[PDB]
């Protein structure tokens, strides 16, 4: 009987796109075929924001663009504080032990969180190298999330995904901020000599279903169902590691020097980043949950 | 032979065609390996592999239930591989005419690429189309990150070359393929909706009134992503209006295409709202 | 070739036959389109299409579970179409001998029909049988109201003609088909049980002791509708008693037929009481 | 576990035959495969009456021949009063809003009614045309149901389905009473110059299952089950319209003049028919339910 | 033809091979019945039947879910029958060279058996292998009590003969088959683990480093029954380590074999502990 | 969720091996796929005894070798008292009406008995014939179960399955004790001129599942489940008759004289056997359940 429309932000041939089906079929069978998921594309319905007003469609997969669009009270963008969550394991612990705090803001918008996961680890892809974070901050790097980095002292240009190549070839950009799969799969690696391999922070997503539609689901099924969404989260975080190493080696075989930070440097960057954290808190409180912030540092 | 291709193309029974073809490819392939230099053969076997992947590998899989998706993924992978194989076969006819072709076109050097394509004539158009088409079909079944952006670009440049030599070719078929490609790629991948519509306009100059494909292409490469159900619905009605008995040639492909339109209409709910 | 038809007819593996035949029909068909005038070819391809619809299209579908009935209906429709195609192929051999034949026999004028059949000789009997048979097979898979009563009548008149020219033909095979037809049609459609039994009596004069079919035909065209389980059970035992290794020719068709008898016996509960 | 034998009166390749399976598979799956329907032919077991004494076999599909064979207290033949129910929509309303009254007589014979539906709309197929109902009534037309028409002033001959052709060719019949699918599919249209397209009344059927066998079915399933039998009823009434227009156009392409009554004429016939209704009530009360009768006129 | 066998053996698509082969066997068989005396033909059709039963009949069935076991049993029975047929075909090439061969080898008289095998030369080895192999394959699919112990013994004696004439034959392939046989038979049936290991040692002298089979054979004919998971796991890793693109010949059989290793690894839980 | 490991003593291509799957699939479907059976070979895990200590693996199929290995308190070997149970029907009655007494000893070892069945009927396969049981007892016949026969006055040699042929060819054995399928399928019939067709006693097996693992199975399912294991038992006992007649006719076609005892002789053997029964009771009490013994004689 029950069929759910999830507007999906997952890419065409991506592992997310595949994982979302593996879940939909994993659920269907668990409900005995009664309940399932039909995916709709967010570009098609007018973008992440236009998707919001359609909650017609009961459920969504969101990046922090829309995830913090319906819960300004959301901590969220807190997780992408630089060097806060610096590796795949640390991210697991944080989505696991910390679920309820991440969740609650969204029941304040009237949604149940199905599961959390990662779109990728931000990296810098640059024409020149850098001795320190500061020097890197001098470079004009192109990329919501961007306005934050600007604060930390990152010179940033806000540009469409297209104009990147022209702007590089023009010397109007020294590089850009992105994930490995993007810079590989687009061929944009061709225009860049250096890629940071040291993870900065996760880009978190994002699956929500409407409180009402989550009602049509019989009490019985909720548990193993939601344990299926967490199975998924874990599979991805693994596969994503594999895919990122692949994308790195392909970037490297292609002649790009791969930048690696030493623990020395990593602590040096952590500190310079923690100082900016104070600064953001002033220049916007709503984009950081300070108790979520600290509870994460506690956790490791 | 002409009357032999007829028992296939003018056929209305998809199972029959599907059970008989594999051996036919195996033969044409064995022949081709005898005569690597024979260009019409190279192209013929490549064209067959491609058309077969589409109709009998990819297409049937698309009709699988959304929980059979693992079976559906194998099939997509199977079809991706057949597309590549058929594309290398066709390309090897170009390599026969223009030794060093492959190495240029896949150089990654835009100039070398364009130079080598510049030396192509109206005689190569069918070959360009099939190779370009075979790679683009493959790319569409290829896991994100597994493609090589230069390979795709090369393939697309071959199609655009074809258009330049012989715009009206095969009742517009090169535009059809191009339209699907531009609409499914970002303005950053060499695609876009503007390009896509432009290619479609050309397609409608050259296309036959008995061909369902261009209606279908309009419905699902344009109307869906632009969320136009109306356009989507009317186009499919146009596609389904055509009588297969009344078409001059390619009854099979009409029948195949209408099977798809029927399906698309059944599922309109999943593409809109 | 004679030893080529042997590897098929004397075969015991149904899958093998089913996977190999489609291409063989495609070839015989392509040949036929080269030589529209060659009569033995016209008939040969038509006969193949018919025999294939029966064994590899209709038959397998009959063994589908009663909830697969949608899949079973497609298959019936598929088979109905193959029967018609094979029947037109065979009929076109008659049209080659007797130009204007088709137009007469399908006139709807009983006199024109009989006149044109009156000019048929013992040489045409196999052709009459296959065409008559192909249409009658189709009619049995045809949605009520979709047939044309004149077409059926014509087909049946062809079979009755055959009987007249060559009663003993092919160990009685024309009677077999006729028996199934008369028993399944109302006394108002040109059928009946009296006719049916009469045709069966003839069949038993000419039929082989190694042929399972006539027992099976007796069980399910006669015994079921007359609700005779005994007759039904004993006949199938007779059919199943025959050793396929011990038969002179047509091992495959024996094996096919026994597969059906086995099935009929398994389900006796659904036909009786 | 449970398997039901329904003796079926549905024709070989008919939509009914197909619809009865679509239901049997629709039920089976709904019960999770436990309960299903195996169909048996009523000609084979000795006709509609012989089928009755077998209620061995628990269930049946019946025309009013057998339907009024086990419930003489049945209204039933009431629905085939001429011009009473004159179109497909009106028949729906009557099988829907009126279910319980149609049903009850059959729980008095110990059966539950699964669903009702139509075998077709009676029409006249005639060698000559007619200015009025009266003139038509003069013609010797061939067809239980027949004895009623005789009352209304219809000259009727009771003849087997065979002898129709001979009797026409002999001039011993001016035409016959039937449904479009019959007159088309038999080729009997060849012998007739005129076919009434204006619907007279439905020929109703008829599916019953034994109270006992309906017990083996768990309480849980009955509802969606019986809502499946009503789904079926509706599909047919649609498909039957399509099939009848097809049969009409084929009859017409074949050169038969199609008779259409104007609303003027339709009311003229209604009246002449209502007068006969009084007459039948006297010449048999048991073949009309007078409160069912009137409740239908009420309804429209 | 050599380039024709190439499009099959060097193929990576199992469905394609499976859809095309049945007709190829049917042809080779029809040919063989024309020329019963042609020895290379007799052997060629027999070899094909055997290889086909294995890859496209038995193998796919082994991958059926444990509740599909009825379907799996039919398939095993199908394959058992194809193995026997292919074995009689090959043996009839021996009967052509050595009239009276069959009657001796199947005598049940050990002396007659050995005498007749004593008259075999290095020219017969391939024939001995295929016949021996075909029967042993059949026996493995044969319901307990349905075999004939003498027939098995004869078949095994043929393989042991082959080893004697040409130990290194086909990169050791006779030992491979022998190893599977000895390990699966009781010390009272002419088998054992001692024999089995001995045959395997020989196999490893002659076998190719690009062949996955001998690793797989080691895993599941030796490691399982001896309950060695380690050996089982390491061997399959070895089998899966081989690159199919890098092998000189028989890509298809490598691909087939790796499909099996993958499966074996997935199910290690069912063979150990 | 639940998957059971049953170490199986069933032969490679045997009917048991097939029947155990038919049951595993019969159960699976009945549980809706939740519970099933994965079979493991007892040779592979170190024999019937080594399998015992693995009860890791929860369940087993056992001959009286292991069946009486974990319940020395078991009656068991009681059923193979010669001429006690002399035909297939009598064995059914005894496994049916007598279930609880056969069972109980194994809940004293902590197992639930799934079902009982027969490996075959012991027969004598001999180079020379015999006028009486006594004369047969003189012959050196080769075969746990063996030590019992020795008592009755059977000269017995305990030999591996291999050395049988050599020992026959050597004249160090006059014959051997076995089942028809063994002597046929091995070709060992070649070495023997006489085969007793008259059944002596069943060789009983043997399926047990651990009390714990039988817990994971929901109360709901146990019944129809255990009625499936009894369905199996019955199928085999039938099929085994067929297979034994086949094996006999093949043995006979092969030139072996088939020995048949007359009822006269059968009673003569029964008596001589009952006398030995007293003797065993002394030379081991634990290998016979005397109340199970007598309760069987009662039963027929």
Domain extents in chain C = 1-273
Q: Is B12 close to C81, i.e. CB distance below 8 A?
A: yes
| Tokens linked to F293 | 């013994």
Q: Is A25 close to B67, i.e. CB distance below 8 A?
A: yes
Give CA–CA dist C54/C44, Å, rounded: 16
Give CA–CA dist D178/E130, Å, rounded: 71
SS3 assignment, position D122? coil
Chain C residues in contact with B16 (beta carbon < 8 A): 22, 25-26
Which of C3, C16, C24 has its CB closest to that of E34? Answer: C3
Give CA–CA dist D96/D103, Å, rounded: 11
H or E segment to which residue B58 belongs: none
Contact F68, F33 (CB under 8 A): no
Q: Is C16 close to E22, i.e. CB distance below 8 A?
A: yes
What letter does residue F126 receive in the DSSP assignment? E
Domain D1-300: which CATH number of 3.40.50.20, 3.40.50.300, 1.25.10.10, 3.40.190.170: 3.40.190.170
Q: Is C12 on the interface with E (CB under 8 A)?
A: yes
Give CA–CA dist F165/F167, Å, rounded: 5
Chain E residues in contact with C19 (beta carbon < 8 A): 19, 22-23
Give CA–CA dist A203/A236, Å, rounded: 13
Q: Which chains touch A (3 or more CB pairs under 8 A)?
A: B
Give CA–CA dist F233/F226, Å, rounded: 11
SS3 assignment, position B18? helix
Q: Is B22 close to E24, i.e. CB distance below 8 A?
A: no
- Best probe of the D interface among C64, C67, C74, by most D CBs < 10 A, is C67
Cα within 13 Å of Cα(A71), Cβ side: 25
Closest-CA distance, D298 to chain C, in angstroms, reads 37
Please enumerate, as own/partner, the contacts of D133-138 that have beta carbons within 8 Å and a separation of 24 or more: D133/D268, D133/D269, D133/D272, D133/D273, D134/D272
Q: How far is CA A96 from CA A16, A60, C169, C261, in A?
A: 19, 21, 81, 62
Contact B166, B211 (CB under 8 A): no
Q: Is F185 close to E73, i.e. CB distance below 8 A?
A: no
Chain E residues in contact with C12 (beta carbon < 8 A): 81
C1-273 under CATH 1.25.40.920, yes or no: yes
Q: Is C144 close to D162, i.e. CB distance below 8 A?
A: no
DSSP string, chain E: -HHHHHHHHT---HHHHHHHHHHHHHHHHHHHHH-TT-HHHHHHHHHHHHHHHIIIIIHHHHTS-TT-HHHHHHHHHHHHHHHHHHHHHHHHHHHHHSTTHHHHHTSS-HHHHHHHHHT--TTTHHHHHHHHHHHHHHHHTSPTTSS-HHHHHHHHHHHHHHHHH-TTHHHHHHHHHHHHHHHSS-TTTT--HHHHHHHHHHHHHH--TT-SHHHHHIIIIIITTTT-HHHHHHHHHHHHHS-GGG-SS-HHHHHHHHHHHHHHHHTHHHH--
Which of B189, B224, B273 has its CB closest to that of A186? Answer: B189
Using the structure block, give the residue that is written with the tokens 């005689």. Answer: B123
> How far from the centroid of its chain's Cα atoms is residue D292's Cα?
17
Cα within 13 Å of Cα(E36), Cβ side: 5
Q: Chains E and F: how many Cβ contacts under 8 Å?
A: 61
Ramachandran angles phi, psi of B239, nearest 5°: -60, -40
- For the purposes of burial, counting CB atoms within 10 Å of the CB of B57, is it exposed (0-12), middle (13-18) or buried (19 or more)? buried
Closest-CA distance, B27 to chain A, in angstroms, reads 34
Q: Which residue of B has its CA nearest to A179?
A: B145
What letter does residue C190 receive in the DSSP assignment? T
Give CA–CA dist B86/B44, Å, rounded: 9
Give CA–CA dist D185/D244, Å, rounded: 11
**Chains A and B touching, counted as 3 or more CB pairs less than 8 Å apart:** yes
Give CA–CA dist E64/E76, Å, rounded: 11
Question: Which residues numbered 19-48 in A keep a CB inside 8 Å of some CB on B?
Answer: 21-22, 24-25, 28-29, 36, 38, 40-41, 43-46
Give CA–CA dist B158/B163, Å, rounded: 9
What letter does residue A116 receive in the DSSP assignment? E
Which of C23, C33, C81 has its CB closest to that of B23? Answer: C23
H or E segment to which residue F118 belongs: strand F111-121
Cα within 13 Å of Cα(E227), Cβ side: 12
Buried (b) or exposed (e) across A16-42, using 16+ Cβ within 10 A? Answer: bbbbbbbbbbbbbebbeeebbbbbbbb
Which of A69, A71, A75 has the alpha carbon at shortest distance from A9? A69
Give CA–CA dist D124/D174, Å, rounded: 10
Give the Cα-Cα-Cα angle B92, B98, B101 (nearest 5 degrees): 70
Using the structure block, give the residue that is written with the tokens 């589409």. Answer: B54
Handedness of CA D64, D69, D75, D77 (dihedral sign): positive
Q: Which residue of C has its CA nearest to D184?
A: C145
Q: Which residue of E has its CA nearest to C18?
A: E22
SS3 assignment, position A11? coil
Give CA–CA dist B201/B179, Å, rounded: 9
Give CA–CA dist A225/A229, Å, rounded: 7
- For the purposes of burial, counting CB atoms within 10 Å of the CB of E158, is it exposed (0-12), middle (13-18) or buried (19 or more)? buried
Give the Cα-Cα-Cα angle F220, F225, F228 (nearest 5 degrees): 155
Using the structure block, give the residue that is written with the tokens 């899966």. Answer: E240
Q: Is B23 on the interface with E (CB under 8 A)?
A: yes
Resolution (A): 2.7
Q: Is C73 on the interface with D (CB under 8 A)?
A: yes
SS3 assignment, position F267? helix
Q: Which residue of D has its CA nearest to C191?
A: D162
Buried (b) or exposed (e) across B243-259, using 16+ Cβ within 10 A? Answer: ebeebeebbbbbbbbbe
Could you tell me the strand order of the sheet in which F60-63 lies?
F36-41, F3-8, F60-63, F202-210, F111-121
Which of F92, F99, F91, F54 has the alpha carbon at shortest distance from F75? F99
Closest-CA distance, B243 to chain A, in angstroms, reads 33
Contact D7, D59 (CB under 8 A): yes
Give CA–CA dist B108/B98, Å, rounded: 18
Nearest-Å Rg of the Cα atoms of chain D is 20
Q: Is C29 close to B7, i.e. CB distance below 8 A?
A: yes
Buried (b) or exposed (e) across F37-75, using 16+ Cβ within 10 A? Answer: bbbbbbebbeebeebbebbebbbbbbbbbbbbbbbeebb
Contact E140, E156 (CB under 8 A): no
Chain E residues in contact with B81 (beta carbon < 8 A): 12-13
| Tokens linked to B246 | 């009344």
Buried (b) or exposed (e) across D268-299, using 16+ Cβ within 10 A? Answer: ebeebbeebbeebeeeeeebbbeebbebbeee
Q: Is B7 close to C34, i.e. CB distance below 8 A?
A: no
CB atoms within 10 A of CB D175: 24
SS3 assignment, position C252? helix
Q: How determined? A: X-ray
Chain A residues in contact with B224 (beta carbon < 8 A): 44
Nearest-Å Rg of the Cα atoms of chain E is 18
Task: Note the helical H segments in F143-216.
Answer: 145-152, 164-169, 180-185
3-state helix, strand, coil in chain C (%, to 5): 75, 0, 25
Using the structure block, give the residue that is written with the tokens 């009865």. Answer: D20
Using the structure block, give the residue that is written with the tokens 């155990």. Answer: F20
| Tokens linked to B67 | 């929980």
Q: Is D13 on the interface with C (CB under 8 A)?
A: yes
Chain E residues in contact with F12 (beta carbon < 8 A): 144, 184
């Amino acid at each position: 009987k029950v069929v759910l429309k999830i507007a999906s932000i997952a890419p065409a041939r991506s592992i997310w796109e595949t994982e979302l089906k593996k879940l939909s079929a994993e659920w269907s069978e668990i409900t005995g075929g009664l309940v399932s998921m039909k995916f709709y594309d967010m570009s098609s319905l007018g973008g992440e924001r236009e998707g919001i007003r359609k909650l017609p469609l009961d459920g969504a997969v969101f990046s922090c663009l829309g995830l913090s669009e319906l819960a300004p009270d959301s901590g969220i963008y807190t997780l992408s504080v630089p060097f806060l969550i610096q590796n795949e394991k640390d991210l697991e612990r944080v989505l696991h032990e910390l679920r309820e705090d991440l969740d609650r803001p969204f029941r304040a918008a009237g949604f149940r969180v199905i599961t959390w996961t990662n779109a990728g680890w931000l990296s810098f892809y640059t024409r020149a190298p850098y001795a320190s974070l500061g020097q890197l901050k001098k470079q004009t790097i192109a990329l919501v999330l961007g306005t934050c980095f600007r604060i930390c002292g990152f010179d940033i240009k806000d540009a469409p995904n297209v104009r990147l190549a022209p702007l590089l070839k023009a010397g109007s950009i020294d590089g850009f901020l992105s994930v490995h799969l993007f810079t590989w799969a687009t061929g944009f690696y061709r225009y860049i000599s250096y890629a940071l391999d040291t993870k900065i922070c996760p880009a978190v997503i994002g699956m929500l279903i409407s409180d009402g539609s989550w009602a049509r689901i019989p009490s019985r099924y909720h548990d193993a169902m939601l344990q299926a969404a967490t199975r998924v989260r874990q599979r991805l975080a693994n596969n994503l590691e594999t895919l990122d190493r692949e994308c790195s080696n392909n970037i490297q075989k292609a002649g790009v020097s791969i930048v690696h930070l030493t623990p020395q440097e990593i602590q040096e960057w952590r500190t310079e980043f923690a100082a900016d954290v104070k600064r953001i808190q002033a220049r916007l409180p709503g984009m950081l949950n300070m108790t979520l912030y600290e509870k994460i540092k506690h956790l490791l | 032979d002409a009357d032999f291709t007829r028992v296939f193309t003018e056929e209305d029974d998809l199972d029959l065609v599907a059970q008989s073809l594999p051996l036919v490819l195996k033969v044409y392939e064995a022949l081709h390996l005898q005569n690597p230099a024979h260009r019409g053969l190279s192209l013929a076997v490549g064209r067959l592999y491609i058309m077969y992947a589409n109709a009998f590998v990819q297409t049937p899989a698309q009709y699988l239930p959304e929980d059979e998706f693992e079976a559906q993924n194998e099939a997509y992978s199977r079809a991706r591989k057949l597309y590549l194989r058929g594309a290398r076969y066709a390309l090897s006819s170009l390599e026969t005419a223009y030794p060093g072709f492959t190495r240029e076109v896949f150089s990654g050097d835009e100039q070398r690429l364009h130079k080598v394509l510049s030396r192509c004539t109206r005689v190569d158009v069918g070959t360009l189309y099939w190779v370009g088409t075979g790679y683009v079909a493959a790319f569409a079944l290829t896991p994100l990150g597994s493609a090589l952006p230069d390979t795709v670009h090369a393939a697309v440049m071959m199609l655009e070359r074809a258009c330049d030599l012989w715009p009206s070719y095969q009742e517009g078929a090169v535009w059809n393929v191009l339209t699907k490609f531009y609409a499914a790629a970002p303005e950053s991948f060499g695609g876009g909706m503007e390009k896509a519509h432009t290619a479609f306009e050309h397609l409608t100059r050259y296309c036959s009134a008995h061909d369902p494909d261009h209606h279908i292409t309009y419905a699902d490469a344009l109307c869906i992503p632009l969320n136009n159900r109306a356009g989507f619905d009317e186009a499919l009605d146009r596609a389904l209006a055509i009588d297969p008995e009344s078409v001059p040639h390619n009854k099979l492909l009409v029948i195949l295409s209408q099977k798809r339109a029927r399906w698309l209409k059944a599922h309109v709910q999943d593409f809109f709202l």
